[PDB]
Amino acid sequence: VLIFHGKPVHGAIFDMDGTMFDTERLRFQTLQQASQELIGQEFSHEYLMQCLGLSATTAEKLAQRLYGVDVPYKEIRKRADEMELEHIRKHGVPIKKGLVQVLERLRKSGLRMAVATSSRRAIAEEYLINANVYKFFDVITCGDEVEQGKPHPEIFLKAASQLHLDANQCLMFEDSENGLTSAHTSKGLTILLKDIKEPNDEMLEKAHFYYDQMYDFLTDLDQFIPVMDMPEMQEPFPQSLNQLTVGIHGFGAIGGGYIAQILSHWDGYTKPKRIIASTRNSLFREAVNAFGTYSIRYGQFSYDERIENMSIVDSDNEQQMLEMYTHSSLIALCLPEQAIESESKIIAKGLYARFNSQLIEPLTFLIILNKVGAKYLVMKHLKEALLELTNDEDVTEHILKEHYFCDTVVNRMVSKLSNQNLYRQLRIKHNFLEQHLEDVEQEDQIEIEDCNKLTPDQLNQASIYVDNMRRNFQPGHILQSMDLILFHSETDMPIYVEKGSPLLEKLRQVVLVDQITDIQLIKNRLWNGVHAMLAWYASLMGYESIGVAMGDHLVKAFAENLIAEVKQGLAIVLPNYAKDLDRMSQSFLDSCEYAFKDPCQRVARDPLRKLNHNERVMASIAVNIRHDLPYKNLLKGAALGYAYAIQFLEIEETKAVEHLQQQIQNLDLSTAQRRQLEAELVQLIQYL
Amino acid sequence: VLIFHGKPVHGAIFDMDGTMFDTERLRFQTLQQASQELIGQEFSHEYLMQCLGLSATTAEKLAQRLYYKEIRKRADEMELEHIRKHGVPIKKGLVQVLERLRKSGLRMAVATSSRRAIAEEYLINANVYKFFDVITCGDEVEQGKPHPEIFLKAASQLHLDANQCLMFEDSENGLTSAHTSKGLTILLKDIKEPNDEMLEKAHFYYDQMYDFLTDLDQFIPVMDMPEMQEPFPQSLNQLTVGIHGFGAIGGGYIAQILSHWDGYTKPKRIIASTRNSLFREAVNAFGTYSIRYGQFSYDERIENMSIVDSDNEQQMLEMYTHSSLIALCLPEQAIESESKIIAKGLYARFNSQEPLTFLIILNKVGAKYLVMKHLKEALLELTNDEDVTEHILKEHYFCDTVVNRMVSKLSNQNLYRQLRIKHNFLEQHLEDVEQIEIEDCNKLTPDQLNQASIYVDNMRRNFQPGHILQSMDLILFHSETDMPIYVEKGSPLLEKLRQVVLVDQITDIQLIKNRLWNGVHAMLAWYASLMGYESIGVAMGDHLVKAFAENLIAEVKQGLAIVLPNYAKDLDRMSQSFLDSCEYAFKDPCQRVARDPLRKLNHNERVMASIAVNIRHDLPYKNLLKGAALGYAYAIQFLEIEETKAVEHLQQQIQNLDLSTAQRRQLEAELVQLIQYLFS
């Protein structure tokens, strides 16, 4: 069902200790801590490295040779085991980086999966439950349920037969020599993973595939499992968390109300365990961290999308902002243009702190900014800040080349909730918390009747657990049917990102492009161009918002007829993006409908600059004329621009024509077509 | 575009006061008490009736004409203070109506005489504000109700004409405002008998909100079978539902069916009954439990659960009185004793002040007959009235079901082990949270900023310990991925439920399930158990266990093809569909499937019935006979029932089999000989 290096894989059997969990390094630490406690001297690193693979008796005899015959090894070993369970039970089993990502890929590939551990059923199940990876496995095969353990192939042969499979149909993952022998002899496809000790030549010769760590196998596996499709609206996020952290530099409208969704979807197999987001807004920070989650409201479908595993931090706080740029695998800069200059310093400090970090992988930096050459601006200011910070041109140049700086095109319009509306929301929901908290004490008491199954010692201990659990959880039962709404966003899913970063390859809500130019040109003419032309019409007709204006059937007709004339033109210029034009065309008309929040002021800024020969208006006219297409609405849009310039911005009527004639001359048209365009456009302006 | 009784609908503009919420009755009582604390003399009831669906401005004009700011301010303060304690009284049906209209693709709004500050406070509180694109209040209107401006401005902001929009209203004044707008007016009675003038103005009339819902529902697409990991609805209706028996199938299947519901709304509360206290206290502590689908390693969280005691009477009466749908999920042994608890509940429902949809989940040929027999005997004993019983029995919808899904309940040992592990994480979490002021003016007053700090600090204190539940789940059930339940036609409610498929000849399917499905399932489980396997999934990996099950399937199908020639075509699909579910049932234990061997070895049950059929028609029953022998072998060895009792049962059941004396003695001789052979 799953093809791996030309071999059909129907099953996957994992060793537990050293392969799935990092319990061999923990057993390394506990032995040292137990030694320092009892005998006073800590067992050498060198001794413990020598003991890897040896029996408990050989290890004891070796300890006797080095630390004397009367060395209390058996009670050192027993004390080390106490320390192991004590650590594992509270702090959790240490899971190898990339395991959960690997398990989700094998499971969604329809593999039957087992564990073949030398440990006992009892302790094995607890570890797998503790780690929350028990769910991934159909059967567990244990050392206390086989006549001959590893390196005899029984445990792997048995694990395979229980899954209804031949050994040769299964991948077999293992760290130890005896284990790899057991898996190999059974006749399975052996995956050897280095844990602590470098594997000897006999092991590397024996193994079918070798990797230095789990993540190196994950990278190999990724070639044989598909990138998932574009997520639909109301589609769930993955349940399983990977060990990666991601960042959103600027927890604003687009940061919290769009980028959060993309990072929450991730690759569809797993999602990050933590999303760090920076804001100066104290109310927003403390509110999200209180709930431990916020929600994005999609008005069109009346759907509240819960974003979990969020951790909001202060932008002014260094320790927190450095922790973002140190631990994050991917970061999304979601700032306005004016903020880029000031925030270039706190980025530089972040990337320099990452460079100085003695722990690792190149950062993927998404530039979320609706502007042409948006990446150039950030990289220019970032370079200046890095020089000013370090005064080391070689280090500054290294940092600028190490990481993946990605230019993006975003289409989703998002609205951030006001602090007045947030306070009003917190008041009404704190009210429900009090309403909820007065009838939790109405229940009261814990009662566990005689099970006639559980012993009275553990029956008593069960009462203490559930009582302690209920007391802490019951107050937060209201969160089931209660959300913290901070964002009102449209339904547009796909983000376009510059191809380069390996980490983007599997991100399902991302559309990779070799160069951003093409989709950035569509964004300019089809979206920003119509938005500006539609805003100039609304402003002159005297409507407060572009959303209100759509009530007037003249405005809505103009909008629908305008996106049609532009789309026609772009289809000829970019036939490869035909599907992207149709999707973006409707997406704009949907968002424009109830666009009450966003004003026309900021959209109608610099009309003369937007009426340039190679810009979002005139370029579309010239394209439509060259390929003989209707441009009557684009002409009306251009006129409304010069009309808006004269009336609102107090531009001279002579200065408008002075500009116009220079733009028409620069268009790739016949001298006949140029003079015809001027004559028509000037008459539309004098009417308005 | 929605087609409501022929007319095309593009939008829907509701009234708030007395249409969406029952706030007209509240402000009625506040204005009276407001005119007692201040001026002393209460307002006339005639004045208040003429103030229905009037703007605070227009109501003040009526007051001066007969005889207010101070009066209404105190009245509004009292009104919203009542809302802070009890909540907004949502008219039953509203949430269900709104979701159907929203998903139909209609452009919806609110047109209320109330001002903005109040209008939003309720719409947020009720949590219906998300369903509306725009709202029109009594502020931004120049001339309030009964002038049509407020309903014209509402339709204008939706970018539609009034005649394209539905208009919901309670007041006589507001209906005139809605009618003069030239829209499709709908009238909902609240606290005034509609006049001749009102009933003529209206295009449609309904007694209450829920009466419209039922009429609207026949123009709303019925959503089809849900997929595995498809989410449940977000919005909650006011309906309660019951699971009589929080067991494997009750908690691990029926809970999913009820949680999906119609796909528009979900029950407010699902009440499940269990004697198991650990299960009860565990779910109530977490507030949720999860169903583990091992095939796809997917955990399905079940929200809005209330686990009650089966013995506790008042809680079981709470279920049967307020529930719209009860699901009986008990085995045969429980039916007799629990029929007393059902009798009290149904009698309590009749005494109190909608019909009930009663699902019987029971693997028995003639399941409903047994349930209805014990229920009538139980009812008659308590009521001592034949007139009230024959009404109750033929008032509610008692539905036979076929359930194909295999589900496993978690052991108390494994649940304790789960709680022990997850408690250690909670303890370590509570240390991390130990070691808040909202600083700077965020366009808020110093009073609000200090009030916000108290709200957030208190919210953090209560919620922060429960943050761990984002990742942490309570796993109580292991279930395969079979979605559709098959129910007999009758109950109109089951038409609209997504996960329910309606059928006619339920008896014919129930018989085939008993013999071909549940019979082979039990017999291979006995063979697997005695061979050493503790899992159905692992056992089916054995060539002998699968060869046995395949041979049984063949012998049963050969007999069913004679008894039911009209179903003979379908047997291959069902027999294969069974083996598919068995093949990879790794978390389904043999012990669960091999329960009650003697009951399953009854003369008219999943083993002996097949043996009897094949003997009459001279069909081979060699493997079927071996499975019966393994059934008694399991009972004697694993359950320990005494060998003498196993023979006394064997001899009695063979005596009941519709065979000749020659066949009876030969069957007894062949079977008892084969039992002693296994123990050799």
Ligand SMILES: NC(=O)C1=CN([C@@H]2O[C@H](COP(=O)(O)OP(=O)(O)OC[C@H]3O[C@@H](n4cnc5c(N)ncnc54)[C@H](OP(=O)(O)O)[C@@H]3O)[C@@H](O)[C@H]2O)C=CC1
């Ligand atoms: N939202 C949209 O409709 C779309 C926007 N975009 C792009 O997304 C980017 C952000 O949009 P949006 O999120 O709406 O911007 P916001 O106005 O919501 O603020 C965004 C973030 O920038 C921070 N910020 C703003 N000004 C400053 C400043 N002067 N100094 C320091 N930090 C500052 C804010 O901090 P605090 O949180 O403390 O305010 C916030 O976290 C813009 O570049 C825009 O072009 C792209 C397409 C669509």
Ligand SMILES: NC(=O)C1=CN([C@@H]2O[C@H](COP(=O)(O)OP(=O)(O)OC[C@H]3O[C@@H](n4cnc5c(N)ncnc54)[C@H](OP(=O)(O)O)[C@@H]3O)[C@@H](O)[C@H]2O)C=CC1
């Ligand atoms: N699960 C499955 O795979 C399928 C089950 N079914 C049918 O559903 C019915 C039971 O399903 P299942 O849930 O598996 O049974 P379970 O034993 O798993 O659950 C039993 C439920 O009934 C209650 N109960 C059991 N015995 C008694 C009794 N003697 N007196 C009172 N209450 C009792 C239990 O209460 P407590 O919680 O206190 O034990 C529990 O709520 C049977 O008819 C079965 O054939 C249908 C198809 C397959």
Ligand SMILES: [Cl-]
């Ligand atoms: Cl990982």
Ligand SMILES: [Cl-]
């Ligand atoms: Cl309802």
Ligand SMILES: [Mg+2]
């Ligand atoms: Mg190992």
Ligand SMILES: [Mg+2]
């Ligand atoms: Mg009214």
